[PDB]
Scaffold this active site. Structure first.
Site, mmCIF file in Angstrom:
data_model
loop_
_atom_site.group_PDB
_atom_site.id
_atom_site.type_symbol
_atom_site.label_atom_id
_atom_site.label_comp_id
_atom_site.label_asym_id
_atom_site.label_seq_id
_atom_site.Cartn_x
_atom_site.Cartn_y
_atom_site.Cartn_z
ATOM 1 N N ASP C 170 0.708 -1.306 0.052
ATOM 2 C CA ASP C 170 0.046 0.164 0.053
ATOM 3 C C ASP C 170 0.888 1.363 -0.006
ATOM 4 O O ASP C 170 1.391 1.434 1.028
ATOM 5 C CB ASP C 170 -0.936 -0.087 1.191
ATOM 6 C CG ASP C 170 -1.947 1.215 1.244
ATOM 7 O OD1 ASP C 170 -1.985 1.802 0.578
ATOM 8 O OD2 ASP C 170 -2.674 1.089 2.045
ATOM 9 N N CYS C 208 -11.573 9.781 8.816
ATOM 10 C CA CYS C 208 -11.793 8.535 9.517
ATOM 11 C C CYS C 208 -12.943 8.348 10.243
ATOM 12 O O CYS C 208 -13.433 7.034 10.471
ATOM 13 C CB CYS C 208 -10.669 8.153 10.485
ATOM 14 S SG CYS C 208 -10.445 9.478 11.973
ATOM 15 N N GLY C 209 -13.779 9.468 10.507
ATOM 16 C CA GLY C 209 -15.193 9.365 10.780
ATOM 17 C C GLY C 209 -15.920 8.233 10.187
ATOM 18 O O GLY C 209 -15.886 7.971 9.074
ATOM 19 N N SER C 430 -13.891 -7.303 1.705
ATOM 20 C CA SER C 430 -14.152 -6.454 2.627
ATOM 21 C C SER C 430 -14.309 -7.272 3.971
ATOM 22 O O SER C 430 -15.061 -8.161 3.980
ATOM 23 C CB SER C 430 -15.464 -5.637 2.537
ATOM 24 O OG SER C 430 -15.533 -4.802 3.794
ATOM 25 N N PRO C 431 -13.424 -6.874 5.003
ATOM 26 C CA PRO C 431 -13.457 -7.406 6.194
ATOM 27 C C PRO C 431 -14.622 -7.026 7.160
ATOM 28 O O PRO C 431 -14.863 -7.343 8.249
ATOM 29 C CB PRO C 431 -11.977 -7.211 6.731
ATOM 30 C CG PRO C 431 -11.548 -5.980 5.913
ATOM 31 C CD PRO C 431 -12.312 -5.881 4.874
HETATM 32 MG MG MG Z 1 -5.443 1.851 3.101
#
Ligand code: MG
Ligand code: MG
Ligand code: MG
Lengths: 524, 527, 523
Positions: C170, C208-209, C430-431
């Site tokens: 990433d 991040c909300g 998606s986790p």
């Molecule tokens: Mg990322």
């Protein structure tokens, strides 16, 4: 899991914080949140006093004294422990330069020009590098002096050096969003910064070319940076000094028009019959124009687009019009619409139409460069506007200058002091400038004290550590290749002896006797 | 999972390695293992060419040439990218000093005196620090010169600087056991070292006191260090230059008596009725004796104990017996038992008894200091013995000296070259010696070339980077406090202009035009 | 200092680079510069072959093979050397997650939520962390197997594990400007990345909300990022795989309106009498409104402002006009002005006026949030537009999804493949999705293969390393506190024995025999 006990604990924590904030150190400091907002964010670990905060309080008192007495804390950018070990003898602050870090100290060991694109721990690591050296030499010196058996023996060692020299460090433009600003500040406080400075540039559009230009961010966005630094400091119970720097004096671009205070300075096109700059430049690249052809197209586009500030566009149209009493209309307009009046473009348009009876074409989308940045006419007055906005959130303000000009520095000082008469000012002494040739010896000699009389209480040569090192190691490399040990004897050793440089006795200076003493204690 | 395919692969890998090892670079290099021993240990990843190994081959050539022509590669210890950027113009190697690292560059940021007790990645990190700066300035300079459109335009830029200056780095004493030596070597090779040096000191009993003394390790233990460095280099296919340093010239202690080559030099007590030194000194501390009283007791114990080397003990006993031809007996003994003969104590005891007719008391446990280290009389001849033992496993050898002494340097050179006439020698030029006072200007000027005529082809001032920086920043701090920008103008800037220091133009020097060029290349593309 | 020799050297270097670029690995790769542009920028040091580039070539072949055969490289985000030592046995790529790095691996040791606001060396350091472990275990294993004296002894050791598992890492959003992108790429290549992915988000307005919304950057700005990655790789002679990720599927904001391809999607106000959102919200804060009152005022402002996309505003005005044949006019407009047509706002205004005979009010400055970001309606079609723009500069493209939806994944694949029929696709599994509850066991079992048949040849669970670790260490902490060594014996050791986990023999696994062998050789 008792609710009422938690509320009571937080209320009491809040009150401790409120009491802290009533100290006189904070008398000019505007906070955009409550004590309890901070209490709920700082965890349940006992409040820590960070060593950096001790140095921050010392720094505040050093600067306060210079302010009261009209004098200057002089310093320069330090590379390494050798440098601060010598600087401590003669200077009362240390500066750490992000420029010098990019060329000498990135934590990835990949050097380069000053773009603040080293990893964000780079300058905090340099702070730790110098700070822990300071503490070590302090310990060494105390131990050495403890061995003196009489006043006379102590005198023979010389006056003590104060190695605990407060450090002010470059925090660049925050290295990302406000959460980066927070984390950066945290590292600085943990690792020993008495103060840091942060500038109203982007972190995404920095340039290094000679001709390249320079983008700033909206006023409020930088205010929020400064707020975020202070918030982190409040959470960590640090008295950290904050220096707000504006780079708007030579800004040519701004990242957004969102802040109404910026509007005066944003450049618009007055020709409604020209294509957008960005689309024109893109079309020209698509048909493979050369680098000279693109500079030609740009320069001609700007000419034909009729690029102006709005107040110029308005004043120009008034002078052309059929109206009576032009000079008095212009004076009225200008008293409502000026560099420092922070008048929104909407407000200025309303006044312009009321005067001319029609709406003039003015479009600041059209001139945007390909990255989408707006054209922006920076200058001294712009910097005054910005520094004024920063001042409530900063212990010192600082207009970045590339050219040492007494008159401009007077104009900035007075412009800021008109709203904040007690504001502490900082000034960078440019290492790019040709000091020997472009001002007289006597002006060189007095320059710093003359700015000191204007209220510039902290002044520094960012790159001096780099240059003194470069000169000395260049000259010795040359002389050593030629003359071998003769060069060392005469140009290093003898000079060290004559000038009384303690490093000459390198074992003792490095702390050999100190550590030998730890050995003896342990094997006793 | 085919067995025969694996054997065939490893045999072919072995043969590639054997062929590598037949290169003339390796003509003096003794290896105590086979090619296949290495093949089975280096994994299945394609052999990597490390940039450091390129610099190692360049370093070898530079040093070979100096050797052949009787000249010297001069250098000194570099602190930082600024320093190597200037040094590259005038010098053909770079040195990295562990001394300077402990004061300026520990990876924990905790400084201190030279005890090699920073974390072991410290000097390798400094190598990377300077090496990547070298590569960057090389990239910058090529790009700049590529813009010249004619010979005349290129001439105006000046001669190119060779920034790719091979680095030799201090590997201290290995920072632990042989597995540490291996890991340390690996880091050095990964991070850009053309060569490293390792010394026959302990990593556990290092001292920094002025009068403190100095412990070495048994000869073979250091040989094994050097073998382990070369083994790592072989596994990584590096031509890494290895410099073996002995610190035995001023050693006063050794960590163990296990190596028979050391025995000549190990100090023993000849008085059979004296208490052990360690127990005497302990008793004296436990009675609350002062630091001066303890120095008195130690010096008194040493004379009461009759400390000497065995050959001295034997010679003394011969002179005080009633035997004929004493001078001829002593000559016979000393011809079989000498600093360089590597005679074991057992063998020397046998000869002593055959001459005197009885066994004399000689005990080297009794004089041990409290840490258990043995007393050891180091000196030039000791260093020759050790360097000779190291030489098959090292491209250069080096007797650490604290005092520049031409005659001693001659003795060491000739002593080593008698067994290894082609051996490359290195010499450290002591930065603590008082050169200005204790040598005439002419002696200063000639010293390096005089040692060069002896075969010291690589010579360096360990601490010169530190001192030049310290002097300049001390003086400017003083002058800046007093005279402000006048001091900067006259004592820095004007001098930079006069001396032609490229850093003066700090934006260009830092590579602003280079990176600006990358920007333009990347944004010179169409939507 | 000979001029002609320099020109000749650079021309020859250029030709080596041209030859490299003619390799079939590069057949879909668009380059915005010449070979000589690169030659003059890479210095005079002999070209280095970086170990990472070896792994890049292996990765390319692995992915090519999956593409040709209609299968999938499955992997997940790895935390540490233990994890890759086990993964190597079963998987053919390794993923390194920036999310996992922010919680577990910042080089400052300061953890936190996924904002890519660790120091920029963080993920490259994690790459090195895993890569050097791979190399070490490879060396260990070869040495161990070299001791076999016969085919039978070798069979007894088991099949060799391939520890050299290519790593894709990433690279977040570049961690600043293009010069940061360059430096970040350089670290990744030095430290062992076979590929990296970079996304069209900001690095300055990350949120991040759960609430919070999400800002992307103009299309071209991300293209330039991808160009800069490839430029660095070219300078370093690396075959580095580049994955272009768009986060536009759930974007609500964009940082600038400068790119005409974005214009369709930029939200404007149609009420010419409303105050600017930012000034309204500011005034309301200055009067000291509470966090609920401010949420009320924002939603009220958005209602009153008449927020729409331009094509909606135009369609609305047509329906409200006195014109004939409204449905025919609307169809004509929408055929020229669509999500994928990349029609500039100027062009769309021209068509709108030609139809209505007047100009309608539409202002996308007014709705800007206080940071100055524009409101932006992201979605599947937006992501197709962007991935299409990225595709020439990226070996794989990837639409970030938080909800596993076969139909949407089909739309994205087919939308991209219509213009780039050979384009490799990647998909994150998606986790955060509730897999057990919100789809059947059989659908769970087939999901990856079904996406594989759409051309998603690389699929990964970003956070699986984190979760398996968290579950196991939670459960043992609980059971150990209660049952002491019984819990260790039964729930760890016995299970390790039963499942054949080599780490059970921890000395041997750690490489004790390998290093012991180095000792013997030296002594
Ligand atoms: Mg990322
Ligand atoms: Mg800076
Ligand atoms: Mg050393």
């Amino acid at each position: 899991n008792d609710f009422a006990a938690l509320q009571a604990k937080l209320d009491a924590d809040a009150a401790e914080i409120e009491k802290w904030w009533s100290d006189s150190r904070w008398s000019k400091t505007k906070r955009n949140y409550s004590a309890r907002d901070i209490a709920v964010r700082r965890g349940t670990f006992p409040p820590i006093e960070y060593p950096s905060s001790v140095m921050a309080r010392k720094l505040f008192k050093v600067l306060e004294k210079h302010h009261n007495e009209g004098t200057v804390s002089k310093t320069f950018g330090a590379l390494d422990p050798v440098q601060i070990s010598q600087m401590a003898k003669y200077l009362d602050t240390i500066y750490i330069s992000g420029w010098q870090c990019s060329s000498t100290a990135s934590t990835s060991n990949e050097p380069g020009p000053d773009l603040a694109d080293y990893p964000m721990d780079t300058v905090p690591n340099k702070v730790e590098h110098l700070f822990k050296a300071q503490l070590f030499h302090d310990r060494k010196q105390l131990e050495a002096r403890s061995k003196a058996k009489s006043q006379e023996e102590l005198d023979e060692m010389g006056a003590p050096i104060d190695y605990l020299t407060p450090i002010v460090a470059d925090a660049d433009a925050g290295h990302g969003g406000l959460t980066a600003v927070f984390k950066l500040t945290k590292m600085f406080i943990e690792r020993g910064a008495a103060g840091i400075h942060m500038e109203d540039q982007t972190s995404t559009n920095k340039k290094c070319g000679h001709m390249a230009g320079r983008c700033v961010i909206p006023v409020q966005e930088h205010v929020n940076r400064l707020v975020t630094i202070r918030m982190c400091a409040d959470i960590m119970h640090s008295d950290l000094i904050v220096v707000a720097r504006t780079d708007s004096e030579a800004a040519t671009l701004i990242s957004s028009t969102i802040d109404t205070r910026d509007h005066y300075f944003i450049v618009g096109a007055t020709n409604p019959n020209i294509e957008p700059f960005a689309e024109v430049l893109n079309d020209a690249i698509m048909s493979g124009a050369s680098g000279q052809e693109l500079a030609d197209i740009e320069q001609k586009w700007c000419r034909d687009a009729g690029l102006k500030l709005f107040h110029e566009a308005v004043i120009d149209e008034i002078e052309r019009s059929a109206l009576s009493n032009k000079q008095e209309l212009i004076k009225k307009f200008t008293s409502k619409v000026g560099p420092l009046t922070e008048t929104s473009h909407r407000e200025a348009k309303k006044l312009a139409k009321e005067i001319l009876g029609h709406e003039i074409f003015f479009d600041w989308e059209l001139p945007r460069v390909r990255e989408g940045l707006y054209r922006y006419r920076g200058g001294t007055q712009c910097s005054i506007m910005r520094a004024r906005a920063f001042a409530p959130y900063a212990d010192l303000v600082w207009m970045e200058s590339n050219y040492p000009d007494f008159q401009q520095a007077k104009e900035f000082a007075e412009g800021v002091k008109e709203k904040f008469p007690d504001q502490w000012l900082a000034y960078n002494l440019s290492p790019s400038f040709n000091w020997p040739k472009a001002m007289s010896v006597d002006e060189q000699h007095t320059f710093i004290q003359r700015l000191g009389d204007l209220g510039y209480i902290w002044q520094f040569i960012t790159l001096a550590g780099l240059h003194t090192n470069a000169l000395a190691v260049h000259n010795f490399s040359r002389d050593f290749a030629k003359d071998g040990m003769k060069a060392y004897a005469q140009n290093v050793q003898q000079r060290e002896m004559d000038d009384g440089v303690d490093v000459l006795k390198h074992q003792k200076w490095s702390g050999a006797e100190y550590i030998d003493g730890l050995l003896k204690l342990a094997q006793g």
